[PDB]
Amino acid sequence: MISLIAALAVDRVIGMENAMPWNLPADLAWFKRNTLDKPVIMGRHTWESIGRPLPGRKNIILSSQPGTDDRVTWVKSVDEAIAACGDVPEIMVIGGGRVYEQFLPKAQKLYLTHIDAEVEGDTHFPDYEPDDWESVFSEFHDADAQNSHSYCFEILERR
Numbered sequence: 001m002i003s004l005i006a007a008l009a010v011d012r013v014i015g016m017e018n019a020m021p022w023n024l025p026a027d028l029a030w031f032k033r034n035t036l037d038k039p040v041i042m043g044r045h046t047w048e049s050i051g052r053p054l055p056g057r058k059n060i061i062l063s064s065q066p067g068t069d070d071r072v073t074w075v076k077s078v079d080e081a082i083a084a085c086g087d088v089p090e091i092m093v094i095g096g097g098r099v100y101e102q103f104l105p106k107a108q109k110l111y112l113t114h115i116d117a118e119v120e121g122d123t124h125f126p127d128y129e130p131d132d133w134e135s136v137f138s139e140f141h142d143a144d145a146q147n148s149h150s151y152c153f154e155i156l157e158r159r
């Protein structure tokens with residue numbers, strides 16, 4: 001199955017002109033927990049953001065331009081990206097905006113972190129209809145010594 005994993009500020013903001021103005025190691029740990037030992041598909045901007053390959057995951061970059069790093073797999077279409085994942089139980093789509101938009105219709109599961117930050121968004125998560133999704137997990141957390149904002153983890157399954 002295909003799943004999307006994303007961190008959403010208020011108004012579904014997922015990306016800004018520059019790095020997001022928060023420090024959420026707990027969210028990064030959640031991201032890692034839920035992507036480890038699964039193939040991850042990302043777009044080129046997200047690849048640049050991360051800086052290097054995500055450890056312990058097959059990294060697949062969806063882009064129309066040729067690849068500039070040999071440590072990851074470069075593909076040019078959605079179907080090629082899926083094919084490159086092979087026969088696995090779950091493929092994780094990790095953004096950004098355009099990649100989420102292309103994979104949402106195929107997705108059966110969303111792993112969302114909702115962050116209590118009001119920011120001006122450059123890119124947004126797709127406008128999904130809550131009516132069509134069932135929350136099967138929710139966990140709320142306050143800001144703390146290591147995390148700059150309150151955040152809530154949710155797992156949705158398509159109804």
Ligand SMILES: Nc1nc(=O)c2nc(CNc3ccc(C(=O)N[C@@H](CCC(=O)O)C(=O)O)cc3)cnc2[nH]1
Nearest residue numbers: 005006007027028031032046050054055094095113
């Ligand atoms: N929940 C969630 N949070 C995110 O910040 C997030 N970010 C993107 C893409 N951006 C990023 C940026 C960095 C790392 C990252 O460095 N993750 C590490 C853990 C952090 C660390 O160990 O320092 C990893 O191994 O997964 C992942 C995704 C896509 N989906 C997300 N989903």
Ligand SMILES: [Ca+2]
Nearest residue numbers: 134135136137
């Ligand atoms: Ca429920």
Ligand SMILES: [Cl-]
Nearest residue numbers: 029030031033
């Ligand atoms: Cl976790």
Ligand SMILES: [Cl-]
Nearest residue numbers: 043045046096
């Ligand atoms: Cl991207």
Ligand SMILES: [Cl-]
Nearest residue numbers: 133134135136
């Ligand atoms: Cl629900």
